[PDB]
Amino acid sequence: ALHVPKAPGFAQMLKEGAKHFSGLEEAVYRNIQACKELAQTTRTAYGPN
Amino acid sequence: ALHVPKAPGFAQMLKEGAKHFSGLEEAVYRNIQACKELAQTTRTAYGPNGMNKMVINHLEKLFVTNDAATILRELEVQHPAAKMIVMASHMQEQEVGDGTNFVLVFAGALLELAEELLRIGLSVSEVIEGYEIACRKAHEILPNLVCCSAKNLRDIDEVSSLLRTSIMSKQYGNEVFLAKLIAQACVSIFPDSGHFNVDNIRVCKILGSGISSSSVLHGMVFKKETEGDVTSVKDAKIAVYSCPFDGMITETKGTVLIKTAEELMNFSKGEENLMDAQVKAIADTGANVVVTGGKVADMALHYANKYNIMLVRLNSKWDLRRLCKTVGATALPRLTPPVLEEMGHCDSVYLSEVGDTQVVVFKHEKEDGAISTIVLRGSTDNLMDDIERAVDDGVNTFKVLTRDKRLVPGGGATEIELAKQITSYGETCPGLEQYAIKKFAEAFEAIPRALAENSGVKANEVISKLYAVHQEGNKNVGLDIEAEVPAVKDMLEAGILDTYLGKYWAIKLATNAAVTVLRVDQIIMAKPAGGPKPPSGK
Amino acid sequence: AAVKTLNPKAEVARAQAALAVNISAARGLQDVLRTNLGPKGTMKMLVSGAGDIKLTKDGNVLLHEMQIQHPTASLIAKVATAQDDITGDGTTSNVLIIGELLKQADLYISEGLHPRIITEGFEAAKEKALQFLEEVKVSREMDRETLIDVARTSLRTKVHAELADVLTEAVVDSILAIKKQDEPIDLFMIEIMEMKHKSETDTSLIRGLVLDHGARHPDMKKRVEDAYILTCNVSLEYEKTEVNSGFFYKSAEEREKLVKAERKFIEDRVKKIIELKRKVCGDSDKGFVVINQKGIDPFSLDALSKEGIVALRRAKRRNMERLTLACGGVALNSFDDLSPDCLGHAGLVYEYTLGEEKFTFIEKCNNPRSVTLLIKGPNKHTLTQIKDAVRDGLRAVKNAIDDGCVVPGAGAVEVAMAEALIKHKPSVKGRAQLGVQAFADALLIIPKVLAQNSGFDLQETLVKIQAEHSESGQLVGVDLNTGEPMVAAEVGVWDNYCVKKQLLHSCTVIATNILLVDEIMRAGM
Amino acid sequence: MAAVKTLNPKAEVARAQAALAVNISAARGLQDVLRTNLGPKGTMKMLVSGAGDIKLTKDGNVLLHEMQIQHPTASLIAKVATAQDDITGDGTTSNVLIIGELLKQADLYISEGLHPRIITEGFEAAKEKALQFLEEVKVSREMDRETLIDVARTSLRTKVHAELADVLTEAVVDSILAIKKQDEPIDLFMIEIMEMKHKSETDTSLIRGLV
Amino acid sequence: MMPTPVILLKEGTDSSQGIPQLVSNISACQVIAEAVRTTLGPRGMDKLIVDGRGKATISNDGATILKLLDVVHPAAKTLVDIAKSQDAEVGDGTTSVTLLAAEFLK
Amino acid sequence: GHRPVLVLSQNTKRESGRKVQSGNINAAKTIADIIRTCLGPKSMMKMLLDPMGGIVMTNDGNAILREIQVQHPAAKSMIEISRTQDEEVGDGTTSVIILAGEMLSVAEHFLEQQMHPTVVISAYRKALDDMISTLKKISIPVDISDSDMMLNIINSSITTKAISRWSSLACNIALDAVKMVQFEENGRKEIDIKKYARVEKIPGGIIEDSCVLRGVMINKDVTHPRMRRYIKNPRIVLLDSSLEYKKGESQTDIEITREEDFTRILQMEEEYIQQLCEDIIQLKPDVVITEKGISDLAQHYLMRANITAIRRVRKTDNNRIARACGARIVSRPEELREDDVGTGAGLLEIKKIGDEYFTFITDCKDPKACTILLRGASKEILSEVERNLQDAMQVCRNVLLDPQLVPGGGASEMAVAHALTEKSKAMTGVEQWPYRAVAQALEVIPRTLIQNCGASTIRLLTSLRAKHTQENCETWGVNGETGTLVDMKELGIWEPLAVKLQTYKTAVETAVLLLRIDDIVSGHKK
Ligand SMILES: Nc1ncnc2c1ncn2[C@@H]1O[C@H](COP(=O)(O)OP(=O)(O)O)[C@@H](O)[C@H]1O
Ligand SMILES: Nc1ncnc2c1ncn2[C@@H]1O[C@H](COP(=O)(O)OP(=O)(O)O)[C@@H](O)[C@H]1O
Ligand SMILES: Nc1ncnc2c1ncn2[C@@H]1O[C@H](COP(=O)(O)OP(=O)(O)O)[C@@H](O)[C@H]1O
Ligand SMILES: [Mg+2]
Ligand SMILES: [Mg+2]
Ligand SMILES: [Mg+2]
Ligand SMILES: [Mg+2]
Ligand SMILES: [Mg+2]
């Protein structure tokens, strides 16, 4: 009653170093956040100023 | 595709150190194999021709013995089915005192034959039912195999002859002498009252002169020394005190309060005078021997020496109780002089040296007394311990004989007759349980087979001869160990007889243990722990 | 994951992962406990970390002794623990029904159905099933035969046939002995005592008390025929002053006087006991037995033994009530006013010695309202198994006495309930009919497991039993010897009504709660 | 514990219901992952390699190859789907889904004490009947341009976006009709697939020649 | 012999059975007798034994020499025990008993 | 040697700028997302693994939040506000978390748009004042005497929990406990359900058997078997001092020089015990309850007068008994009076439940304290039932103190949002945009209800917003089960005004507090 086992199926068959992000919140929102971060890093160099 | 994952469910839910065994092959066959291994380990010590075993426990303590119970106790048995077999053997030892090796041999034979029956196609339930039916039939048959009764227990030679078979398996070379010793010790005890107490037999082990110099003493022997000058009394009048031989003190708190010079001057003189008065009052009753369970004060010892009183101090309370039983006195709680009913009498009390040990002897001259002591001599501690085990077996056999006087022939005769009759009964039983009944009957062959193997002859020839002789109509014929060729002889004439109650209990316990082992189908062992013993076992 | 984002060392299972984990754990527990159900089940062996051996067939003991560290396993274990604590039976059936409910629910959830509709169907089916159970119970006058039948249906499932037959008589007789009319049964008045010297079939009922201690004075009588029992809670040993007194003397004579004087308080109570004994019995024919909950110093033991009184010290706390109910005396906390009317009576008192431990028997009471069960066996694990079995039997008989009704066993009630649920399913509105069907299929697990343990096949036996029930309308169960349908009421296979109701309620509640779990979290570090 | 572990202590073995449970779990896991692939309304999967290469795909076989899976039953299913792709070139996701559902349905009855062998005879009889019905139900047509365009639509629309699939339908049908010889096997090696990285995805087309 | 995942005795238990172990026991007895062999007779010689603490014991007595020897062999301990028994009951002959027993075994 | 020199100590991290604001708002949004799915009547269970080995199955937002451990201080602030909301009103713990997360999320936009946080905070405070005004405006009165309306209120409060199917019994239990605990002394109204409304859980039985007793129940038994376990009309005497001989606090020593002094001391101890017992008996009671041990001699003396006695009882349980049976706890039996004797308990029974004894002092007439006997499947189920009952009792107390109600199911949120948007049209400054942002961010509750119900969010929310722009539609919410717009005058889902006010205040001030944060410094010790 102190540990959460991996769900049977794909979770157990995943490799030791692999990652699996599925669904809207886990994948799409994270990708949008990463793209927004990249745009934020490059934004300040826009225009003559 | 290079690893086999654990199956979903209980396999993954199991703890990291736990193990799970289920089914026939993983559990039942493994348990049967372990029990057979234990039985084979113990088998070589069966019978008079059994060899002793050197056993070293976790504390590096020597053990030489062919006693199955002691060997099992001093082996770190880890397989739990073997643990059940061992505890069944220990229960047999507790209830009767002999037949533990019989229990192991019978249980092992039953389990191997049950494994064979399971292999050929029988179910566990059928095997268990057949074993239970065959055990009931054997218990019904056993009273009919009784050859003779004890018919006298106050006799010396007859009791020695009865116990000779019991103590012939252990110390096979010289069993007549030990039989006489144990017979005398057991006949001194066991008065007109039918009850017989095993604890009333005391064994004192003093090495030096070989076991042939052992004797029996109608009294008690303590490996201690007298605390006073007097070391010999011829008309002893022991007075036993549980309290220390000193002036009693308050249990709350003692504080001597002095307010004047006179009190300081007179306190020690008054205390010494009180001690002298108490000792003289004790002596005036005639008590020339004083036994105390506590420490002895210097002034009390001095005044006891002044009045010629023999002092013996017994630290153990069990020894004090046994001395009170032997002499016939009462352990007084205070230092008051004893009245005539509480004053014990012994015919001779003296200090003596045996070998290189100083002992105090409370010797009776009459062939009576509540407690009798056997003094054992020898050259090795291990040999003397083995002789003590043999004496314990003889005393337990005498106790069983007091409980039940019926006897059955030994040397495999009883087992062969039981096997023959159980096979005859099972040949008339329709259904699938006939195989189990026949296997239960065949399991009795392991006793004469073990005896023949230990004696050095071929077991098959002996068993065939035993079947032939039992078929022609002789039920008292067993294995003859005094021959280089496989041969048999009548055992009623030879006096090689076993207690009926011992055989009955051994058969019952072995069958129960085998059935209990067979009933187990799944095993769930937790992760082993090296804890500092259970709290109950300290 | 959000939780993993906030707490890096967090284990989280979400959405279908939660259901998969819970259902896998429940199905694993069910797979382990299938072989327990029924008298034809297989005994399981349990070895602890210290090497202790435990043979058992009870569901609760097996659940506690499995080496499992799973959350859903803990939940099911708690449910079974409550089941055993209140009713005393049905733990294995509890686990099986929970597992099969979860499996049947998954059978529909995996096809896109939401668990809420399944839970609604489960609850509607539970209500209808409770109604049917009320309609099907058999209200009977609990005579001796019915109680023997119930005790048989429990013990035969728990232990060997002959041992069960002996324990049936033992348990039924004990319950009949301690029970008073229209009064709740106190199972605390049956003392379960273990002895380890003879066979398991030697277990019997002593209409009295057996104590795990004997007289400590060697000169006391070992057997008293007609005895006056004096149960008491008075310290008969030396007691120290609460105010730290100590003694002050100036000579040896003063010390002797103080020693003789400090025992007067205890000696007064000893003298009171002696005078009461002398007044009550003026001859040597009758006897006196003193059972004290507190210690007795050797001086008082000697003083009592000099008057032929057997004294027992450090008795159990509940032994006071047990002796007052059995012998018929009055427990005393002081000797301020002791009279013969407060003395119990016993028709025979004797001591039995077994190895290093000694036992005292108090029997032949006029009408013992408290009795004791003596468990005898050659092994410790045998004693533990017999104690568990007699506990289950006592619980079953007490439940049968309390609830005047009784439910037919052998899975007949489950089959009838499933049939009624299937018939009632069209009345359910919406898609909860799927949940009702799943509940009926889950209820049908008991005959399936019974047939599997008995060796037959599930499908053929189940369809035969269901067809027989539909054709005849009777309560036909499973015959574990032949596999044919059989009227459980006629043959005497009975089940406790309270046990069945508790099974339904607890199983439905826990299944509904588990089905609605969508996330398992571990972020307390 | 088992016979295998007696001879080889460092051996991993699953026996009786354990092996069946392992196989069912692996098949159901693969089916659960590949459920979202079926149909034109399926979802893209982004597959990142160890070196960091990005592969957006919907194909069942390609997705199985880029799984990070080390399971035996998964390997068997992957081999079967690989053969399916090698010979016919389509139906890998349907292959995995049907295998997983077959195993799940078989386990549904096996858990009721039924032997798997009876399920196997049921499976083979049902397969024979289904093959007969499929032979009965097929629609024999003259493969004109319209039917080929419809088939190319039914494939590409599932594989790629709507308008991109519409362009690829014309491209593929025209290329096949260009290289097709009357009553002769079609040699697909004669359609060179050249890729450039300078225009939009809808600028792909067909050249009646070579590049 | 197989690993047998569940084992009968405790792991690390050493067992020796048959004629070879009896022969080894006899050889150990001879080894013990050799350690006091030269201390017998008017021409006998003393033996010096140093303990862990550095104390040196010089003795011609067979029983003392055997006691100072830290024997651990189960069969060899019997010779030391019988030497102690001879010392206790008689006080002389402690060298003779070990030699006689070892010669019997040889 | 020659160690590096620097201003602050090592491991003293410091982060500044808009990155801090983004991190704080992201932490708040993550906290909201953790329990977003546990809102509404169709919320799902959640399993929490206690570090000590326990398991918590709960739908309460506060329990879920307090059962987890976080490192980001913004998450800590969110947990703190959830605990504050739970402690203040009793429920609304997940609604306030969701609202605070949404408000911070919509403030992130203006933070990105160069607007200073102070302007955003001022707009937030104006919005909070206007929401308070609107909530007070759209409230409705409630009569205390109408028991059916109180039961309906408690039902609407507990429809979102797992006790929704036993709602009727749960509402009756909570209402009876809250009414009977209600007490007034010296002109001071008091509803202390924490101390005098005890919830006792005993696993087993059925939940339908759970009930609230007209008295108290304790896990205690008689000290002696000869002692009555069933008294019809007991006269209760309560004690908090031991009935045994004990040493004084001064170092007292006796000096015995005479023979008879030892027995005299022991007899004096016995006589002192007898004197205390006689002082107790002088009032002629029937049962005696003590918080400290009772000597065996005292037990004998009490039984001589046929008096029941319970040995050791906790302080809180003794206070509950005193409130229930009208007794007054005393320490010195010599100071005992007739008024202190507790009469009013109509029955005392000590029955056996399962394998444990329980003492009942139920059947009281006008008792001020209660125990809530809970029976159920297991311990976790009973714990969740207890949490739901606590929520119900808190809601009942809030309604008793404040008889105002506001519509539920998102109707209040939509009405307040519409009022705020209408008021925002008058403003011409830059503050209007965050004002309207708060107005629309308040719409997260109906959106979450629709999302949990499984219905389509966009069209349902658009239709609801259009409906709330009409004349009299302030009570139009959304069904949490059927996913349809319904008037709450018909559905009947009403919730106390105090809960909504506390939720809005806590959410707005949490947003304000987290908006002021910049230049996070960490690593230093104390
Ligand atoms: N002189 C003898 N000749 C043949 N058999 C004997 C003789 N003495 C004893 N036995 C057999 O040896 C068996 C005793 O074996 P033993 O070593 O005592 O095992 P246990 O101690 O378990 O009884 C008896 O069953 C008996 O039949
Ligand atoms: N002699 C019998 N014949 C047929 N069915 C039986 C018989 N005895 C018991 N049963 C059935 O088998 C089941 C045994 O359950 P049991 O093993 O006691 O589970 P638990 O211990 O959890 O109650 C009972 O439900 C009963 O209906
Ligand atoms: N039957 C219902 N239909 C629609 N909305 C409901 C219903 N019951 C409760 N609600 C809404 O759900 C909210 C209660 O959800 P709950 O899980 O209790 O959250 P909290 O713990 O924050 O109060 C209330 O604000 C109420 O408006
Ligand atoms: Mg023997
Ligand atoms: Mg049962
Ligand atoms: Mg395709
Ligand atoms: Mg010499
Ligand atoms: Mg709420």
3-state secondary structure C2-60: HHHHHCCCCEEEECHHHHHHHHHHHHHHHHHHHHHCCCCCCEEEEECCCCCEEEECCHH
Answer yes or no: do D13 and B4 touch at CB < 8 A. yes
**Sign of the dihedral through C-alpha B100, B105, B108, B109:** negative
Q: Which of C157, C399, C417, C444 for a ligand 2 pocket mutation test, highest count of atoms within 8 Å of Cβ?
A: C157
Alpha carbon C38 to its chain's center = 18
Q: Residue D153 is which amino acid?
A: R
Of B247, B522, B492, F90, nearest to C42 (Cα)? B522
d(CA F90, CA F503): 11
A46 is in an annotated binding site: yes
State which H helix or E strand residue B62 sits in. Answer: strand B62-65
Token output for F433: 């945009």
Q: Find all residues with CB under 8 Å of D43, minimum gap 6, and list them.
A: D36, D37, D58
**Sign of the dihedral through C-alpha C422, C426, C428, C432:** positive
Burial class of D26 by CB neighbour count within 10 A (0 to 12, 13 to 18, 19+):
buried
**Sign of the dihedral through C-alpha B484, B488, B490, B496:** positive
C-beta separation of F359 from F310 below 8 A: yes
Q: Which residues in B390-494 belong to E strands, given as ranges?
A: 406-409, 477-479, 488-490
Token output for B180: 């006489």
Using the Cβ of D24 and the Cβ atoms of chain A, whether some distance falls under 8 Å is answered with no
Q: Find all residues with CB under 8 Å of B160, minimum gap 6, and list them.
A: B176, B179, B180, B182, B183
Which of 439-458 (F) contact C at CB < 8 A? Answer: 454
**Which stretches of chain A are DSSP H helices?**
10-13, 29-43
Relative to beta strand C485-487, strand B310-313 is unpaired
d(CA F211, CA D173): 77
Relative to beta strand B520-525, strand C357-363 is unpaired
DSSP secondary-structure letter at B485? S
Answer yes or no: do C53 and B83 touch at CB < 8 A. yes
C-beta separation of C265 from F266 below 8 A: yes
Q: From the CB of residue C345, how many other CB atoms can be counted at a distance below 10 Å?
A: 15
- C-alpha of residue C158 to centroid of ligand 5, in Å: 7
Chain F environment of C502 (Cβ under 8 Å): 204-206
Please, what's the b/e burial string for B391-429 (b: 16 or more CB within 10 A of its CB; e: otherwise)? bbbbbbbbbbbeeebbbbbbbbbbbbbbbbbbbebbeeb
Token output for F26: 């992201």
C-beta separation of F104 from F23 below 8 A: no
For residue C203, give Cα distances in angstroms to B40, C303, D128. 34, 38, 66
Token output for E45: 């010689």
Please, what's the b/e burial string for C283-318 (b: 16 or more CB within 10 A of its CB; e: otherwise)? eeebbbbbbbbeebbebbbbbbbeebbbbbbebbee
Resolution in A: 2.9
d(CA C186, CA C201): 26
- Edge-to-edge strand ranges of the sheet holding C204-206: C190-195, C371-376, C204-206
State which H helix or E strand residue C247 sits in. Answer: strand C247-249
d(CA D29, CA B115): 42
3-state secondary structure of C69: coil
C-beta separation of B344 from B239 below 8 A: yes
**Residues counted in chain A:** 49
Subunits touching D (CB < 8 Å, at least 3 pairs)?
A: A, B, C, E
Token output for B328: 């016939």
What distance in Å separates residue B395's CA from the closest CA in chain C? Answer: 16
Relative to beta strand B497-499, strand B219-222 is unpaired
**Which stretches of C308-405 are DSSP H helices?**
317-326, 380-402
Of B191, B189, B239, B198, nearest to B217 (Cα)? B189
C-beta separation of F287 from F223 below 8 A: no
d(CA F480, CA F445): 11
d(CA C394, CA C371): 13
Q: Find all residues with CB under 8 Å of F117, minimum gap 6, and list them.
A: F21, F107, F111, F515, F516
3-state secondary structure of B353: strand
Among D8, D12, D73, pick the best mutation site for testing chain B contact (most B Cβ within 10 A): D12
d(CA F130, CA F127): 5
Answer yes or no: do C12 and A26 touch at CB < 8 A. no
C-beta separation of F280 from F336 below 8 A: yes
Token output for B57: 């426990």
DSSP secondary-structure letter at C116? H
Of C497, C417, C503, C505, nearest to C140 (Cα)? C497
State which H helix or E strand residue C432 sits in. Answer: helix C432-443
**Which stretches of F201-353 are DSSP H helices?**
261-281, 296-304, 315-325
Chain C environment of D108 (Cβ under 8 Å): 107
Using the Cβ of E81 and the Cβ atoms of chain B, whether some distance falls under 8 Å is answered with yes
Q: Find all residues with CB under 8 Å of C508, minimum gap 6, and list them.
A: C101, C122, C123, C126, C439
- Kindly identify which residue of chain B lies nearest to residue A3, measuring between CA atoms: B13
d(CA A4, CA E19): 59
Token output for B353: 């040296």
Using the Cβ of C2 and the Cβ atoms of chain F, whether some distance falls under 8 Å is answered with yes
PDB experimental method: cryo-EM
What radius of gyration, in Å, describes the C-alpha atoms of chain D?
22
Alpha carbon C293 to its chain's center = 26
- Provide the greatest CA pair distance for chain E: 62
- Provide the greatest CA pair distance for chain A: 62
Of B380, B375, B392, nearest to B205 (Cα)? B375
3-state secondary structure of F484: coil
Q: Find all residues with CB under 8 Å of C318, minimum gap 6, and list them.
A: C188, C191
Angle (nearest 5°) at CA C342 between C338 and C343: 105
**Sign of the dihedral through C-alpha F5, F7, F8, F14:** negative
d(CA C202, CA C199): 6
Torsion of CA D159, D163, D164, D166, to 10 degrees: 80
Q: Which residues in B139-218 belong to E strands, given as ranges?
A: 148-149, 201-205, 215-217
Please, what's the b/e burial string for C116-125 (b: 16 or more CB within 10 A of its CB; e: otherwise)? bbbbbbbbbb
Ligand 1 atom with the smallest distance to the CA of B102 is 22
C-beta separation of F210 from F373 below 8 A: yes
C-beta separation of B473 from B420 below 8 A: no
- C-alpha of residue B170 to centroid of ligand 4, in Å: 7
Subunits touching C (CB < 8 Å, at least 3 pairs)?
A: A, B, D, F
**Closest CB from E7, E13, E74 relative to B62:** E74
Cα atoms in the 13 Å half-sphere on the side-chain side of F421: 16
Q: Find all residues with CB under 8 Å of B416, minimum gap 6, and list them.
A: B444, B445, B448, B463, B466, B467, B470, B478
Strand partners, C376: C195
Burial class of F356 by CB neighbour count within 10 A (0 to 12, 13 to 18, 19+):
exposed
Pocket of ligand 1 (CB under 6 A): B 46-48, 50, 68, 98-102, 165, 168-169, 410-411, 451, 478-479, 481, 496, 498
Q: From the CB of residue F343, how many other CB atoms can be counted at a distance below 10 Å?
A: 16
d(CA F400, CA F380): 30
What distance in Å separates residue A7's CA from the closest CA in chain D? Answer: 10
In the structure, ligand 6 is a single-atom ion and the residues with CB under 5 Å from it are D 90
Answer yes or no: do D69 and A13 touch at CB < 8 A. yes
Q: From the CB of residue C410, how many other CB atoms can be counted at a distance below 10 Å?
A: 28
DSSP secondary-structure letter at B240? E
Tell me if there are at least 3 CB pairs under 8 Å linking chains D and C. yes
**Residues counted in chain D:** 211
Of B336, B332, B325, nearest to B293 (Cα)? B332
Judge whether F93 counts as a catalytic residue. Answer: yes
